[PDB]
Amino acid sequence: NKTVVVTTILESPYVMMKKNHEMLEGNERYEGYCVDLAAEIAKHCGFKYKLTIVGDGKYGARDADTKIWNGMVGELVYGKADIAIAPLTITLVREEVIDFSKPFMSLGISIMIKKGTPIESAEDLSKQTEIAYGTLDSGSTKEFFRRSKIAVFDKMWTYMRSAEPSVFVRTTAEGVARVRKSKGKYAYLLESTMNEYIEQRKPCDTMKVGGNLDSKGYGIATPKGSSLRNAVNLAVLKLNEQGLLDKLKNKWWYDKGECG
Amino acid sequence: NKTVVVTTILESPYVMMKKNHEMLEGNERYEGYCVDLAAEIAKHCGFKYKLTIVGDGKYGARDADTKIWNGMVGELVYGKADIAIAPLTITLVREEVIDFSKPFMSLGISIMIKKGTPIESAEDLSKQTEIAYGTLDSGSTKEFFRRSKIAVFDKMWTYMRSAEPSVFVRTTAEGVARVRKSKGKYAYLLESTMNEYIEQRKPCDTMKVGGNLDSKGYGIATPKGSSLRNAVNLAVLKLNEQGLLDKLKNKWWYDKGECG
Numbered sequence A, B: 001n002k003t004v005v006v007t008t009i010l011e012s013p014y015v016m017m018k019k020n021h022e023m024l025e026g027n028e029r030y031e032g033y034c035v036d037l038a039a040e041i042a043k044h045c046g047f048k049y050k051l052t053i054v055g056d057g058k059y060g061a062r063d064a065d066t067k068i069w070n071g072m073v074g075e076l077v078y079g080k081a082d083i084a085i086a087p088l089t090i091t092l093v094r095e096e097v098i099d100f101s102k103p104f105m106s107l108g109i110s111i112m113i114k115k116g117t118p119i120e121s122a123e124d125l126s127k128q129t130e131i132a133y134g135t136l137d138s139g140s141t142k143e144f145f146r147r148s149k150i151a152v153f154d155k156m157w158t159y160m161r162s163a164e165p166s167v168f169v170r171t172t173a174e175g176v177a178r179v180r181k182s183k184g185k186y187a188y189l190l191e192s193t194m195n196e197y198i199e200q201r202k203p204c205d206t207m208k209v210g211g212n213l214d215s216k217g218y219g220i221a222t223p224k225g226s227s228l229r230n231a232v233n234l235a236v237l238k239l240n241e242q243g244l245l246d247k248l249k250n251k252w253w254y255d256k257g258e259c260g
């Protein structure tokens, strides 16, 4: 038996550096929802594992010209990792090159505003110009807008792709900071899960507004032909059915929420 | 090549007989969310198909003594149908014997009451005995309560399994009728999708109360070894991303609303 290499991403509250990480070793350096989930998946499937943080800090996209996959998807496609346990969105283009388990969490694209921003919906954002808006610069949210045929989102993509300066951000943290420092003049499009988490964090100056734009899931991903595929899929189902996944969401989102 | 036999279930608004069904033939007799979904999946996967209503009128459970599966699950397991396109809940015990596509719709177990029934949560139901409560037979909701170790749900099952007269019903229609005729003395445990639909239909005398008890999905199911498995899975993802699944929910839930 070989130790399973797990690719993941520093994204709060999924995977975070522990405050005393420099004094700890291996998997013990990290904490969060996905750290807890990895330990359980490994236990139920009967494997030893090593958490690794994706080298380029990205989720996964295929470059238009080079056809090279980056991010966690790349690590799986190119054989650098055996499994991805992360807030990695199940999409058709990804499912064509890797396998996903059944989803372990639901989400949809959503709008983050600085409190008091006169925006209720995606329609509102598309109808006006004073408030800028954007997405994570690589990921499923950007691709949703790029590939969309619905009029509001098509109009939104047409604005976003040509906006100057760039409305796209390198990390979720950068998007959140931009909202917080822009005095209501920037709104951020991000997954409801991350939006909901930030809403419960000091300085309690952001909120989710409106309905989700779509409905999808995060899944645990393996390269095609992985011997882990079946066991991992069944483990996610078992953990959902036994109430663990709901427990972990409560633990990391709400139990220690900082906004009352 | 060969006409694909689709097993499905008469369940509003997934598969319903059209008002003028007696003067109609084959697939044309039926309408609903899953009728539309089957047409789309067939188109993208390039097959012809025959919709057939499950013989025993059940979703599917395994007899504890004989180990024989019934319902749509049994029809797949024993080779009577090629695919199930229905509101069929993805579960561990089912995933062990059949394959499921990625989910096409999210749901959770929920409570249906007659309007004015003094009940707000599962906790509320468990703490009393004047209001009876039950679930559908041979489905995933029953299994949830049978298997649950969460104290509220365990107490609910202990009551439910022994209650006299029986609190379990054969069909959703039977559960709904029981609520409507029991003058507030029966509450029904059913999936949020079905509950929300019924709440928007005449005579507008029921409602969903409390949050969902769990979070899960319906999937398209195929027998193990099926040549359709990959194409069906990819087609479900295609339809979600194209916005078609969202259009279909709006068509069959919101647009069919009768209660203003």
Ligand SMILES: CC(C)Oc1ccc(C2=CC=CN3CCS(=O)(=O)N=C23)cc1
Pocket: A090, A102, A103, A104, A105, A106, A107, A215, A216, A217, A218, A240, B102, B103, B104, B105, B106, B107, B215, B216, B217, B218, B237, B240
């Ligand atoms: C925890 C999990 C069991 O709850 C979920 C998560 C997501 C879905 C889901 C719903 C609708 C569409 N899609 C698109 C394919 S998806 O991205 O695989 N998931 C969905 C359902 C239930």
Ligand SMILES: N[C@@H](CCC(=O)O)C(=O)O
Pocket: A059, A060, A087, A088, A089, A136, A138, A139, A140, A141, A142, A189, A190, A191
């Ligand atoms: N979960 C996304 C990243 C975040 C986003 O795009 O909003 C992905 O897998 O690409």
Ligand SMILES: N[C@@H](CCC(=O)O)C(=O)O
Pocket: B059, B060, B087, B088, B089, B090, B136, B138, B139, B140, B141, B142, B189, B190, B191
């Ligand atoms: N969707 C359920 C049936 C409805 C229920 O059990 O509430 C199943 O697949 O068994």
Ligand SMILES: [Zn+2]
Pocket: A040, A043, A044
């Ligand atoms: Zn466990």
Ligand SMILES: [Zn+2]
Pocket: B040, B044, B242, B244
């Ligand atoms: Zn289509």
Ligand SMILES: [Zn+2]
Pocket: B044, B045, B238
């Ligand atoms: Zn297609």
